[PDB]
Amino acid sequence: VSLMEKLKWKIKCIENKFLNYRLTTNETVVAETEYGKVKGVKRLTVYDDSYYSFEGIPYAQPPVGELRFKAPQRPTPWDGVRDCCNHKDKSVQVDFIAGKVCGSEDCLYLSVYTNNLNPETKRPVLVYIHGGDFIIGENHRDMYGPDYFIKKDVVLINIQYRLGALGFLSLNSEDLNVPGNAGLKDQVMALRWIKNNCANFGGNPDNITVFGESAGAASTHYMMLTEQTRGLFHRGILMSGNAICPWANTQCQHRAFALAKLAGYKGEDNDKDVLEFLMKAKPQDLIKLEEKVLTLEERTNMVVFPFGPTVEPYQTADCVLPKHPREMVKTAWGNSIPTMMGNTSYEGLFFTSILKQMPMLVKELETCVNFVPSELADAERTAPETLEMGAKIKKAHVTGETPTADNFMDLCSHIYFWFPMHRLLQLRFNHTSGTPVYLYRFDFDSEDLINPYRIMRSGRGVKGVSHADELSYFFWNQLAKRMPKESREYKTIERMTGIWIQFATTGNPYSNEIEGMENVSWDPIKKSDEVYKCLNISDELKMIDVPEMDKIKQWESMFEKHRDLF
Fold first, then answer.
1. Which CATH number covers residue 304?
2. Residue 361 φ/ψ, nearest 5 degrees
3. How many whole angstroms from its chain centre is CA 205?
4. DSSP-derived pairing of the beta strands 37-44 and 24-31
């Protein structure tokens, strides 16, 4: 991020602080939780809607001291009234714009928002799990403001969970009780809190929907796979990701030693001594060094992040992932709940900045061998069969004589999003009994309403609908502005939140009450379908054949002689 954008961001942070003061009313309210009373505050939106805001509700003990790297523990109850009129810290992380470490280990909180604490009927509860590659993100309203959803009669809940090495360290030694996935166990404990407490805020514990984007979509999917959460919620929405994406898990059991060494550890590679060192380290030091953890060999093997969701090496009471997610799909409780999945129309545009800095990346399209799924490729990526598979990827995406950056970004849309979605749909059809799944495609481009991901990706003036561009139509954020009621952006807010609320309510995303949806016939995907149909959201709402289908089929063709691995 440029120094100039960094200055613009600082200005926006200050402006947003004072706007949030002007949107705060003097009306506070007390609600009950199983652990004690909480005080929230009535806030306005720039559209003059209003909602009650409770932030900083603990769902677990602060994971500090001996609780670092452990599964979350239930919080201690309190007498009196806990002040929930302001947000808490985010999980320790490198700030996505300033580039310095921020946050706190004391981050296991959720926020609850609703326009009416005593409604006439119990309401759909929507639970948002943020993305950020399991290393950044937060539930702060400067990025995830509830202002658009609270126009309608729902309860919206935004959770935090531990990130990075503090959320995803994993050690083989059973005696140490650090099996991995602490951050996913945080999500489990938050969902249990929601089931047990949402009624105190007007919510229906029999009608909970979990949704998330990017790593939040992978997280939502993990919450639909694990036995830990069986029956806790009733619909799921996977926005640009899922748990079988190549980036969504990793075996990181040997990386604690590498992290300790970078932090000054002088001892031998045994889990007990490594853990003792990491338990004493300052959390900022571990998080700052995480970018250096992967070895030359792991980078060569195209591991993207050192710490993240992992297959746990031994069983514990709180175990989330006892097997690879592909195997977990075969017995998953969440295969039997209504599900919606989708992507944007140019996901890979997210990588524009990386390609401008490292233009030699386009040379990987010469043979495309590095994009062949690892389960199909030989170790050296030189086998004739591997070259043939790469040639199929190349034909799918290299449209002219010379490979281009746009070809590379189109490939990225498929390797990271569309192809894993296809593989999941086809795996899941084998392990479900007719429970519907619905596809959307977000295809609405505008620079009049944006979100901070555009700044992170250096995407000013860049046309096309990148990964995460849809979040501007779901959540208020500090770069947003009030839009005219007749504007294409305003209508897109109403449509996107309206469809999500309709799906959360009924398990069917169609409603004739959504403007532009009157003539939509949105069928879920059938096992016998050869071409997927999706609702394409542009300036209009239209059912279409997925434009990406032909390229999806070309990727699938690499498995013709290895169908057991598809």
1. 3.40.50.1820
2. -60, -30
3. 23
4. antiparallel
d(CA 403, CA 388): 18
**Residues composing the chain:** 566
**207 with 231: CB under 8 angstroms?**
no
C-alpha triplet 553, 555, 560: angle, nearest 5°: 80
Q: Helix 549-556 to helix 384-397 angle, to the nearest 10 degrees?
A: 180
Cβ-based neighbours of 152, under 8 Å, separated by 6 or more: 497, 498, 501
| Cβ neighbours of residue 193 closer than 8 Å, sequence gap 6 or more | 34, 57, 59, 110
Alpha-carbon gap, residue 444 to 372, rounded angstroms: 31
Query: Which segments of 387-474 are extended strands (E)?
Result: 437-442
Q: Please give the Cα distance from 463 to 261 (Å, whole number).
A: 44
Q: How far apart are CA 566 and CA 558, in angstroms?
A: 9
Experimental method: X-ray
Q: Is residue 514 part of a domain?
A: yes
Single-letter amino acid, residue 453: Y
| Bridge partner residues of 112 (DSSP) | 54, 157
Question: How far is Cα 515 from Cα 495, in angstroms, rounded to an integer?
Answer: 7
Any domain includes 387: no
Angle between helices 215-225 and 182-197 (to 10 degrees): 70
Query: What is the tally of structural domains in the chain?
Result: 1
- Measured N-to-C along each axis, helices 549-556 and 419-428 cross at an angle, to the nearest 10 degrees, of 70
Query: What is the rounded distance in angstroms from the CA atom of residue 412 to the CA atom of residue 115?
Result: 40
Distances (CA, A) of 117 to 110, 458, 493: 17, 41, 24
| 356 within a domain of the structure (yes/no) | no
- Structural domain boundaries, residue 459: 3-349+415-552
> Which two tokens mark 329?
């799909």
CA dihedral 131, 136, 137, 142 (to 10 degrees): -130
> Which are the catalytic amino acids?
214, 347, 467
144 is a domain residue: yes
Residue type at position 122: K
Resolution (A): 1.4
